[PDB]
Amino acid sequence: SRKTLVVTNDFPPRIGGIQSYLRDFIATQDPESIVVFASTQNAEEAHAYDKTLDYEVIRWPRSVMLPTPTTAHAMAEIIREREIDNVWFGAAAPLALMAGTAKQAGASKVIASTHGHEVGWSMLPGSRQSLRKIGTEVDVLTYISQYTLRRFKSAFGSHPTFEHLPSGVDVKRFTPATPEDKSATRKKLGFTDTTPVIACNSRLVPRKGQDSLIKAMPQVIAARPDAQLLIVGSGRYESTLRRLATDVSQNVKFLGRLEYQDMINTLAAADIFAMPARTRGGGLDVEGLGIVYLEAQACGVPVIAGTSGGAPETVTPATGLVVEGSDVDKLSELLIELLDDPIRRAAMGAAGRAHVEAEWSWEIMGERLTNILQSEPR
């Protein structure tokens, strides 16, 4: 059994995408084979959280962990003292620059995780050479999607192996609603069993395409006058969305950021999950993990996904439809068609559930990580 040190600037109790990603992947592993070396944003909250866990977390008493000589030496000391076999950098850039030190300290395998923003036109000076350095010293680079892999090109060079490691989804928490619960959820929203419901769970930013959905609504309600769009989440773009929703305000609900279970109940009672993510910000504002699509499929709800980044990779033609987010006419058409086709929706939702069970659960994804951490070095 190989022992892994996870070196990361991103770790709970701080909330975020990489925090959730690492927290959940670590949880799939044998706790005796895991040590975490993490930065500390709040020392009292960090300590309280670490007490709940069954594996060691060593806190670096800095808000930000940086690849300095003293951080390198501190890491090296942990590698020697805890007899570490693997060093897994939670984010490749910049911390995986300490990979050389990790190996000198006794680690026989270095893994580094990418998240999709390492390569782009806003890259800082020195960054391309850093990615090369990281590449030569890292044995396994994990990547979240085929899209990101393509975007890297040969930035990391010829040494590392690339392993696909997207997020899993908790298929026990996200689960299809019973008819009774679905009816009760709808009643609490002020709807009935026949109300056409489109749900969108996501941060309220232009990228997620809540604006596209709102703009499609006039056409959708012309076909289905009682159709309801549920916008679940919070973010800077809220006031724009509300402005955009003015002339369809009776058919669009802003539910705010909902409590976890309430959000699941709402998602599971919907007819369609729709998030037509589009790529913006000169190509730099792109969809990464697409977790909301996985959650929807786990709840047995048909999905409308955008063409942005790795979003299409989370669905199959059997579970969802991919749409160009900026094509509002095509979006409303797709929405109307699916709302008029309950038989297909039931089949798409059923296929959605089967798809996440077979390829997206934390049990399935956990196996991939176990292989990376427990295999002999190349």
* Domain edges within the chain: 1-169+359-378, 170-358
Query: Residues 310, 279: contact at Cβ < 8 Å?
Result: no
Fold of 1-169+359-378: Rossmann fold (3.40.50)
Strands (E), 41-136: 56-60, 86-89, 109-113
Q: Is 161 left (phi over 0), alpha (psi -120 to 50) or beta?
A: beta
The answer to whether 203 is annotated as binding is yes
The answer to whether 280 is annotated as binding is no
Fold of 170-358: Rossmann fold (3.40.50)
E strand or H helix at 86: strand 86-89
Q: How far is Cα 123 from Cα 208, in angstroms, rounded to an integer?
A: 24
Q: How many other CB atoms sit within 10 Å of the CB of residue 173?
A: 12
The domains spanning 1-169+359-378 and 170-358 adopt the same CATH topology: yes
Q: Is the peptide bond before 176 cis (omega within 30 degrees of 0)?
A: no
CA nearest to 314, candidates 330, 328, 326, 297: 297
The answer to whether 294 is annotated as binding is no
Query: Residues 91, 115: contact at Cβ < 8 Å?
Result: yes
CA gyration radius, the chain: 22
Identify the bridge partners of residue 230 per DSSP, sorted by sequence position. Answer: 199, 253
Q: How far is Cα 254 from Cα 235, in angstroms, rounded to an integer?
A: 12
Q: How far is Cα 96 from Cα 113, in angstroms, rounded to an integer?
A: 9
The DSSP line for 14-36 is S-SHHHHHHHHHHTTS-GGGEEE
Sheet with 161-164, side-by-side order of all strands: 56-60, 34-39, 4-8, 86-89, 109-113, 140-143, 161-164
Q: How far is Cα 306 from Cα 308, in angstroms, rounded to an integer?
A: 5
C-alpha atoms less than 13 angstroms from C-alpha of 125 in its C-beta half-sphere: 0
- Matching residue, tokens 């709402």: 266
The phi and psi torsions of 201 (rounded to 5 degrees) equal -95, 120
The answer to whether 22 is annotated as binding is no
Query: Residues 110, 79: contact at Cβ < 8 Å?
Result: no
CA angle 60, 61, 65 (to 5 degrees): 55
> What letter does residue 361 receive in the DSSP assignment?
B
CA nearest to 276, candidates 214, 234, 228: 214
